[PDB]
């Protein structure tokens, strides 16, 4: 979906296939293994899927990625302390808090 290259045996929809015709062009929430090429060519659109690894930037400008228990706009509750300058050491990325008054 992001366009990462994959090489190997393909399973999915083809022109010379029988029995799997139903189901195409529906929405696939959760996991997946259908190829974005097949989605594009059989449906005309690619449904982008979110990544679970997310990133942030440390106070010194360095890049970090992973689970990163920082602040996100989707989750509320962790708003106090985000606004003004953080104290010593570092646990919250340089990325300013989106918004929220707790």
């Amino acid at each position: 979906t992001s366009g990462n290259k994959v090489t190997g045996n393909e399973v999915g929809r083809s022109e010379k296939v029988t029995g799997d015709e139903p189901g195409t062009c529906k929405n696939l929430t959760g996991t997946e293994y259908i190829s974005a090429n097949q989605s594009k060519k059989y449906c005309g659109e690619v449904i982008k899927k979110p990544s679970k690894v997310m990133q942030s930037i440390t106070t010194d400008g360095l890049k970090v990625s992973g689970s990163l228990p920082g602040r996100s706009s989707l989750v509320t509750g962790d708003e106090s302390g985000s606004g003004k300058q953080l104290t010593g050491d570092q646990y919250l990325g340089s990325e300013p808090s989106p918004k929220g008054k707790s």
Binding site: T1, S2, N4, K5, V6, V11, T31, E32, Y33, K49, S51, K52, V53, Q55, S65, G66
Partner: peptide, 17 residues
């Protein structure tokens, strides 16, 4: 099938680290 799904997920999650 599980291999395909896992490799899709890993490839998508690896492109930005």
């Amino acid at each position: 099938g599980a291999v395909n799904a896992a490799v899709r997920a890993g490839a998508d999650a690896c492109e930005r680290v």
